Design a binder for this molecule. Sequence first.
Ligand SMILES: Nc1ncnc2c1ncn2[C@@H]1O[C@H](COP(=O)(O)OP(=O)(O)O)[C@@H](O)[C@H]1O
Ligand SMILES: [Mg+2]
Ligand code: NA
Ligand code: NA
Length: 380
Amino acid sequence: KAAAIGIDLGTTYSCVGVFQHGKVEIIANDQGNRTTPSYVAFTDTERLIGDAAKNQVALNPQNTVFDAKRLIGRKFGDPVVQSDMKHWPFQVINDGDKPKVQVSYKGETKAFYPEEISSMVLTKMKEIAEAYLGYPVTNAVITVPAYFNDSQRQATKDAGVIAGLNVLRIINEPTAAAIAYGLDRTGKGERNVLIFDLGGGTFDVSILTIDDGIFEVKATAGDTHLGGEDFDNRLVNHFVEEFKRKHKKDISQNKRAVRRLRTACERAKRTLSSSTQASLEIDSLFEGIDFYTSITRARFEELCSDLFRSTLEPVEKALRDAKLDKAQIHDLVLVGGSTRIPKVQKLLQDFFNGRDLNKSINPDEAVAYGAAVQAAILMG
Ligand SMILES: Nc1ncnc2c1ncn2[C@@H]1O[C@H](COP(=O)(O)OP(=O)(O)O)[C@@H](O)[C@H]1O
Ligand SMILES: [Mg+2]
Ligand code: NA
Ligand code: NA
């Protein structure tokens, strides 16, 4: 009985799980990581996926693809595509009203549909699963945002088929998170569930009604350009200003210095979820000058205060659209890596008058956890 896997094909990070023996195994990749960047890179010599793409020793911005999930299933002329293109370092081209990402690989220009890019991330997730299981995987559940339309769903499925998978079902992210917590097991009688999902790039609030195992999506809200990367960017700008103060040099036009600082800021952020301060130490940041400093949790919170507070507006809106009072939410579920931030948890819990948060499943894994549960259900 060869297991089906569950894949969270994320905007910024993806995750794969498998259900066996009554229990989900979230599968670590070859570097030991339980999540894997949704990044593909092309060089003079190789195609890199995941951690190797995100962590290249040498900047390759034109040929390092990410955010494919923002393109998948959309027409080239979609306002969202045209908007997003302006900020990406890689080129997007029109092929018969469909976007393609164009890069250089082994010295030749070529282009890929978003579903081909995303198939490369799914193949990596498949391979991570296969390395753990010891045999080929042929069946999967793949998740998508609740707001995805038929074309975005179909393109995600087609990314799965490309990758060699039989896609058992495409299921919504917030539904997968609820399944992870066993909330689908409820009997007859409506239960309202709020899923608060703050990831790397996007913020999604969904309100679900579950009644005897049947899910209805009652409301969706959020901000497609609010996520952990924006918090990293506030720390970057802070530290650029601190380096000018101390060294009388502006690092901001040095692409490598900014990248290294951003990576260091992301790591210090994560530390600040469990400690009240973090050390940020980068050798030879700019013109040979070491930058050894630190950041407190309080200061981080100040830097990002408007961003964190803004997460409550979509929560209000979703409650209004679902025609529900706070007290009528039965369960609050945290999804997305950025939900580990203490101040974000505080804001939400305070808004809900002290209500417990369902947070025992690592929030960046919950989607995959549920998709793995559901893939085994569907296999029978
Ligand atoms: N311990 C942590 N504290 C703060 N943020 C974190 C923590 N762990 C992960 N994150 C952040 O979570 C984001 C990724 O969220 P994730 O849910 O894995 O992906 P995606 O949004 O693709 O679904 C990144 O911005 C990352 O820095
Ligand atoms: Mg996510
Ligand atoms: Na993810
Ligand atoms: Na999200």
